[PDB]
């Protein structure tokens, strides 16, 4: 670290070196901080967490009890020990509270004033953070497994919604049109994720073992269908071209958006070239998931080597994206881990679980 400081100070190394190397070291040193706590407000398991993209100060959390909690992640107290207090909450007494499990919650990108949350009550509600009131509600004919707003589109503000129906709903928050559907899947869409690179690329993963990349502008179906083998087992596309050998319940674009990570109920995680959907043949070993719903997992940002934090049973398995080497397993939960979310500002992790807890993992030293 002193060599790094001297090399930064004397100009031998770009300061980008010290940032990325030290962030990588902190991520490798990621450990359960009992010196930080998150206030327990959910009566049920936390299904989803979302730290705001701008300023990374506030976090949303949606539980199976239908409540939403809005936490402050900054140590506003002068002590080195603090609890991430719950700023707001859509509780059992809020007139607009979800009737069933909140399965996904997402801050509006580009501004903290709005956030959207979807439930098994077949609703995607848009909330005004300041008034903590719903500004819009999108009812769907079948329960929502996942929703996602594009983190990058300054032009369109579509929410891709995956429900049990075989179609992917696109809901325009700009004046309300929830009619557009992307058809081509055959079973419930368990995960949707916009590319962080292209405004109009949407990756959708479904229980029919297929992941499809769509160009929502295009009127001619999916761009690419992910194939495990890339052509070794080739068939006229009616049942082949499966991304996994089970249900694909999790999607995550890497930071630069040039690759896609999919996790399926075949207990595998695969890394795909997001441009031509080619499997990169990164191993990753066995990634235990048996989730019957969407599995929210994240990647690291702004480190020398990219990492993926995937829920592995009751633990969080940390892998290197481009080599597959399992860095570690963060073990602090008591039940299955449903979601983990990455604070890129300080290389911190927050993980929710069915044990109705949110555990913060902070780098040690």
């Amino acid at each position: 670290m002193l060599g790094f400081l001297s090399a930064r100070q004397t100009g031998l190394e770009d300061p980008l070196r010290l940032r990325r190397a030290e962030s990588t070291r902190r991520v490798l040193g990621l450990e359960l901080n009992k010196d930080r706590d998150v206030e327990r407000i959910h009566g049920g398991g936390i299904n989803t967490l979302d730290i705001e993209p701008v300023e990374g100060r506030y976090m949303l959390s949606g539980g199976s009890d239908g409540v939403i909690v809005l936490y402050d992640l900054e140590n506003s107290s002068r002590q080195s020990y603090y609890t991430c207090k719950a700023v707001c909450s859509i509780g059992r007494d809020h007139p607009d509270v979800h009737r069933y499990s909140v399965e996904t919650v997402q801050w509006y990108p580009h501004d903290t004033g709005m956030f959207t949350s979807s439930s098994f009550d077949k609703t995607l509600k848009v909330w005004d953070t300041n008034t903590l009131q719903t500004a819009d509600v999108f009812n769907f004919e079948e329960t929502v497994y996942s929703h996602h707003m594009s983190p990058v589109s300054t032009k369109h503000c579509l929410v891709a919604v995956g429900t049990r129906g075989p179609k992917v709903q696109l809901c325009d928050l700009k004046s309300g049109s929830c009619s557009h559907i992307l058809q081509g899947h055959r079973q419930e869409i368990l995960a949707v994720s916009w590319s962080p690179r292209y405004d109009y690329i949407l990756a959708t993963a479904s229980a029919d073992s297929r992941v499809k990349l769509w160009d929502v502008r295009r009127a001619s179906g999916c761009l690419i269908t992910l194939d495990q083998h890339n052509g070794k087992k080739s068939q006229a596309v009616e049942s082949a071209n499966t991304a996994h050998n089970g249900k694909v319940n999790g999607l995550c674009f890497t930071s630069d958006g040039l690759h896609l990570l999919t996790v399926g109920t075949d207990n595998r995680m695969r890394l795909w070239n997001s441009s031509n959907g080619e499997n990169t043949l990164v191993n990753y070993g066995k990634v235990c998931n048996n989730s019957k719903k969407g599995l929210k997992f994240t990647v690291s940002c702004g480190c020398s080597s990219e990492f993926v934090f995937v829920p592995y049973g009751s633990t969080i398995a940390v892998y290197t994206v481009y080599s597959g080497e399992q860095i570690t397993m963060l073990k602090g939960h008591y039940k299955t881990v449903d979601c983990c979310v990455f604070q890129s500002n300080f290389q911190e992790l927050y993980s929710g679980s069915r044990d109705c807890n949110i555990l913060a993992w902070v780098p040690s030293l």
Binding site: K34, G332, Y334, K335, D355, N357
Partner: protein, 141 residues
């Protein structure tokens, strides 16, 4: 060694009752050296994994007394104790299938009362005791 001798002398189900002199001798021995307790856990996992429920109860009580008294099992049960969290989640809750639960219901009640005691006994920064108690109270107490 002497740890195993005391474990055999105490966990024996022919006289299944708490004896204070042996427990204080074990406390003093564990205080004399920390390495007594690190292998003691391995002994206790032998007694928790043993067929007889009375031996499981004895090993649970020995673990609890070493954690609360010796000051060397405290650094095992309230630090580097993910094994302890997993044993708490597996003892009272169902053993992971196919393997079912093998303990007795009286042992389940004793473990519940031990968890309730340890919630306040040592919880300065170890709140997963209380979280596991709440999960039991809402799933498989």
């Amino acid at each position: 060694q002497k740890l195993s001798k005391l474990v055999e002398e105490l966990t024996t189900s022919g006289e299944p009752r708490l004896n204070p002199e042996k427990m204080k001798e074990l406390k003093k021995i564990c205080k004399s050296s920390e390495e007594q307790l690190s292998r003691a856990y391995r002994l206790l996992i032998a007694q928790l994994t043993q067929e007889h429920a009375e031996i499981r109860l004895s090993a649970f009580q020995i673990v609890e007394e070493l954690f609360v008294r010796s000051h060397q099992f405290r650094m095992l049960v309230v630090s580097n104790f993910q094994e302890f969290l997993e044993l708490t989640l597996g003892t009272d809750p169902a053993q992971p299938l196919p393997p079912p639960r093998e303990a007795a219901q009286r042992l389940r009640q004793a473990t519940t009362r031990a968890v309730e005691g340890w919630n306040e006994k040592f919880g300065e920064a170890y709140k997963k005791l209380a979280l596991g108690y709440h999960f039991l109270r809402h799933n498989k107490k």
